[PDB]
Design a binder for this molecule. Sequence first.
Ligand SMILES: [Ca+2]
Ligand SMILES: [Ca+2]
Ligand SMILES: [Ca+2]
Length: 494
Amino acid sequence: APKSEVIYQVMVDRFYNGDPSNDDPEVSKGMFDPTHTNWRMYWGGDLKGLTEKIPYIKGMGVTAIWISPVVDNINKPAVYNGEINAPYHGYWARDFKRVEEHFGTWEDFDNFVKVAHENGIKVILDFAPNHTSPADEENPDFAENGALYDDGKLLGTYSNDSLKLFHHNGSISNWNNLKELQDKNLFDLADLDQSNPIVDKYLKDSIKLWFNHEIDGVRLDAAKHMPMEWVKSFANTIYSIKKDVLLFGEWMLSGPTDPLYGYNIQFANTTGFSVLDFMLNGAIRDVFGKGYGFERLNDTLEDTNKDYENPYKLVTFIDNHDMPRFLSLNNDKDKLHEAIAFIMTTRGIPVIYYGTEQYLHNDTNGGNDPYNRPMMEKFDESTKAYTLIKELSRLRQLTPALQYGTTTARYVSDDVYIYERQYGKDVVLVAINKGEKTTVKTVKTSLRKGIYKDYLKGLLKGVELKVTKGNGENLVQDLTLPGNSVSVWTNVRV
Ligand SMILES: [Ca+2]
Ligand SMILES: [Ca+2]
Ligand SMILES: [Ca+2]
């Protein structure tokens, strides 16, 4: 009876500024905007602040915090056309053995792990071993020239790479060619050569250090840009040091016909990392954000459940830091609530991107990066979305049917989706109406006959269920779903 998880993804610089003294550190000064109007500067969020907000996060039923990368990032900005770009997001590492000084010290990090563990919450580290930082081999004064440091000891720069640390093969151009995706630079990011035994032992020593500070898992950045066999050895290293670790990779897919989807599946089946579920994500945004009909969602769900060997390890999401937030895509809270309810009641592990529960969004430039990383504003624990996210996790803890159960579609139309989750004798039936009020024909269900109250207590306009005994499969009768509603029914005792 495995444990069910719920992930909250935090971008540390944009979550909560707990400590003004690390806003503009001496060693890396000039990259802080206190006004939060230059969207590519550090804004001050830090580990102290994240720690103070763990009760808020725990009040949402979150079981694991995916924290954006907190290794030391470059101490000079990347300047493009006079535009200061700070590594406020954490993906431009200079030193994988040190904590980013804008975010805190080792003591602040250890305190964050301690308080998270005090509240029953796993810490999942976003780790980006594909690369260091932006570099121009012909201009060492640009940014930090992709420098790699080992706990303060310089191992090399891109323009002076004595130890053969990096690939010097230009940038990625043919994005459908695997070898090009692995051996060239992701944009201008100095690409690490994990085949170099120096780099191999460095990256593996680094992740050992972080686990010595009691992290519980890894979200693996840019997983398609590294050789799959090295990523497999990397997971073996982590498994060698800790038994129950949550490992999943960001293997980005462009859409349903992405030519590389087969390597993604292969990655998730063999490396020991599962994947973030981009196929399901696109279907979610299509049907809830673009008005497509539910059969696109159920078809995608059915395909993924066969395509992946272990689909209950998939990590599901509605949005993230690399695409417009759902409300930028479609500013409809009812549709957001329904999407949240969906991933909460679908197989695998759902992610809530920070601030979703506060309807946080900025729609400049379509809501695209950097505008999908706004600063957290209110921490209101009474919003309907906060309440929704808090309640469905309770059911995931009462039954494995949500994360680990089979999936049976009971009714699929353009605007109505009824699906059933089963684990042993546990049954959860869910009905989503993203259209107007309607009354459904006759639905099968394995729920015993009787009347079921909405598990959500009408929070999303949910109704009762009325099951008659069919002999064989039972019969749902006279199900009138209000418009823009979600109902959840179960035989699991509450
Ligand atoms: Ca700060
Ligand atoms: Ca730094
Ligand atoms: Ca690479």
